[PDB]
Design a protein around this nucleic acid. Structure first.
Ligand code: 0L7
Ligand code: MG
Ligand code: MG
Ligand code: MG
Ligand code: MG
Ligand code: MG
Length: 539
DNA sequence: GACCACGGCGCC
DNA sequence: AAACGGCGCCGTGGTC
């Protein structure tokens, strides 16, 4: 390309180099733009951002987030990554996309700008005739990137002093557990080492091995294996408790307070738009989509996620979303009727599991039922949920029978989905998002059947993902008008931050927007709560 | 110091 | 672990 002085014309494709991958923490090392056979290199990157009308090109959201960080209202526009991801969700990296669609991902901003221009031209051409994918791009993915950029730049407040105090307390309990484990082992060792633990349990203590690990075939020390050995030796329970505490402390309690941004005083994640095979988002650096909530200590950690002073968090959560989606996709009368009657499958299953009336089902019991309901739906074995429920194999067989027999058209939709998948080479969501599954025609059964479970799950999980994305795009401008903030997305949950005076109105509006985003054969119901912290806002 | 595979596990 | 699906991060063991 012909070198030309900054600034570039309108509609130019940007290229840029960051000191690190996280846009909220990155230094803008270089900035460039390409248009009309010319490349414009910015002598002064930060000031040059002001000359841009939009961030158009590869990883557009990243540059936009950095711009927002610097108080510049620069929205992301066209991004070849989004086009490639829609064509094939295995297109997740700019390295891969460049190689596949015409270029090479380098470390020079000018070459990145030129690459962005070429890739877009080529990828836009491949979207010719793909009207459903084109609809997803224009109406969902492209505007969503703008929404996500604002969310990333906003961040969420965290009670740092609380977590630091909690760390000291957990450390003392960990010390008690590890000391007991070493005593019971008869000698100290690296309890964090599963290799050393394996030898202690199975060679020294002579406990029976239950399972083997996948890649190397070692005797597994997983929680599922330990759960089976809970009554064989006192050391097992102590290890399980050590596992829980060290997991939470090393993953959340200790790292998170060190990740507070010095300018915003808040915690900033990244919402990756081209990272999953189903169309779901992912969250990273740090992952805020896996904040603990199951155990007491876990809930204690979730409490650290708080609203700004004078504000309140609003948590909105779709009700039984994939089951409702399944009802629409399959068209099963029995399942549709269940949601028309306003029933709760999770509660009903949980009542059966613990053998109690459905009014005696606590949140923890209902949570466990989700493993059973979705597990069985997506192909869990009779042997597994017999171990999950600690019931005889024969009973576990019977549950799987009645589950599918209650909803006959579900199995029909699955068989239809798999056959179409074999013929076309891909499955699709309700809106036409695709996932290629070539292993549907594998001659090895274990491989073929594994692919099948991936294949028929994708339209269900993906449709729910499409619906949430659409809801986010619609909801965002409404929130901006109300002075409320969209903070987090957790797959089928949104976390908002609103002024105390407007909290209830925001909750009501967001609920209605989410419920009426795209009507199905069954009503979409959304549970909403308001609180000073994340945990309180979901109760 | 970084990167890796692995086992393991937090969430949806 | 076991024929649930979808993610990212932890420490270990290991290389470079
Ligand atoms: N396994 C430990 C127990 C907690 C859990 C969970 C799961 C959730 N999902 C998918 C299906 C849900 O529709 C979607 C949202 O998760 P959710 O809100 O927790 O569950 P749901 O929306 O069905 O219940 P609720 O929101 O009405 O309480 O994520 C799952 N999908 C699969 N294949 N397996 C799962 O375990 C889960
Ligand atoms: Mg407060
Ligand atoms: Mg939900
Ligand atoms: Mg949820
Ligand atoms: Mg792994
Ligand atoms: Mg290992």
């Amino acid at each position: 390309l012909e070198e030309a002085p900054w600034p570039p014309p309108e509609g130019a494709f940007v290229g840029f180099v960051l000191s690190r991958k996280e846009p909220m923490w990155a230094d803008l090392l270089a900035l460039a733009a390409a248009r009309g056979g010319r490349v414009h290199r910015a002598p002064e990157p930060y000031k040059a951002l002001r000359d841009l009308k939009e961030a158009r090109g590869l990883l557009a959201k990243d540059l936009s987030v950095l711009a927002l960080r610097e108080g510049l209202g620069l929205p992301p526009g066209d991004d070849p990554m989004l086009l490639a991801y829609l064509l094939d969700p295995s297109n997740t990296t700019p390295e891969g996309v460049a190689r596949r669609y015409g270029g090479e991902w380098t470390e020079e901003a000018g070459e990145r700008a030129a690459l962005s221009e070429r890739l877009f031209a080529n990828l836009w051409g491949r979207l010719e005739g793909e009207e459903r994918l084109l609809w997803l791009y224009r109406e969902v993915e492209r505007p969503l990137s703008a929404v996500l950029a604002h969310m990333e730049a906003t961040g969420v407040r965290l009670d740092v002093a609380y977590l630091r105090a909690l760390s000291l307390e957990v450390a003392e309990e960990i010390a008690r557990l590890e000391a007991e484990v070493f005593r019971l082992a008869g000698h100290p060792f690296n309890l964090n080492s599963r290799d050393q633990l394996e030898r202690v349990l199975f060679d020294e203590l002579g406990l029976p091995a239950i399972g083997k690990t996948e890649k190397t075939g070692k005797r597994s020390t997983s929680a599922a294996v330990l759960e089976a050995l809970r009554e064989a030796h006192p050391i097992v329970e102590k290890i399980l408790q050590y596992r829980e505490l060290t997991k939470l402390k090393s993953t959340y309690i200790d790292p998170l307070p060190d990740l507070i941004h010095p300018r915003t005083g808040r915690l900033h994640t990244r919402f990756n738009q081209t990272a999953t095979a189903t169309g779901r988002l992912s969250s990273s650096d740090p992952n805020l989509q896996n904040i603990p909530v199951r155990t007491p200590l876990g809930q204690r950690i979730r409490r650290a996620f708080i609203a700004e002073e004078g504000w309140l968090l609003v948590a909105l959560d779709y009700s039984q979303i994939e089951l409702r989606v399944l009802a629409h996709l399959s068209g099963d009368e029995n399942l549709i009727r269940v949601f028309q009657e306003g029933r709760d499958i999770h509660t009903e299953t949980a009542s059966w599991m613990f053998g109690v009336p459905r009014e005696a089902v606590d949140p923890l019991m209902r949570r466990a039922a989700k493993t059973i309901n979705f597990g069985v739906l997506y192909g869990m074995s009779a042997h597994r949920l017999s171990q999950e429920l600690a019931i005889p194999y024969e009973e576990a067989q019977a549950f799987i029978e009645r589950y599918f027999q209650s909803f006959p058209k579900v199995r029909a939709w699955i068989e239809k989905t798999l056959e179409e998948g074999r013929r076309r080479g891909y499955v699709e969501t309700l809106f036409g998002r695709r996932r290629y599954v070539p292993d549907l025609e594998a001659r090895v059964k274990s491989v073929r059947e594994a692919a099948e479970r991936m294949a028929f799950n994708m339209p269900v999980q993906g449709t729910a993902a499409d619906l949430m994305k659409l809801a986010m795009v619609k909801l965002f401008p409404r929130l901006e008008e109300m002075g409320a903030r969209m903070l987090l997305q957790v797959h089928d949950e949104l976390v908002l931050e609103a002024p105390k005076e407007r909290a209830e109105a925001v909750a009501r509006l967001a609920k209605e927007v989410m419920e009426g985003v795209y009507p199905l054969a069954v009503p979409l119901e959304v549970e909403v709560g308001i609180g000073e912290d994340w945990l309180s806002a979901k109760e």
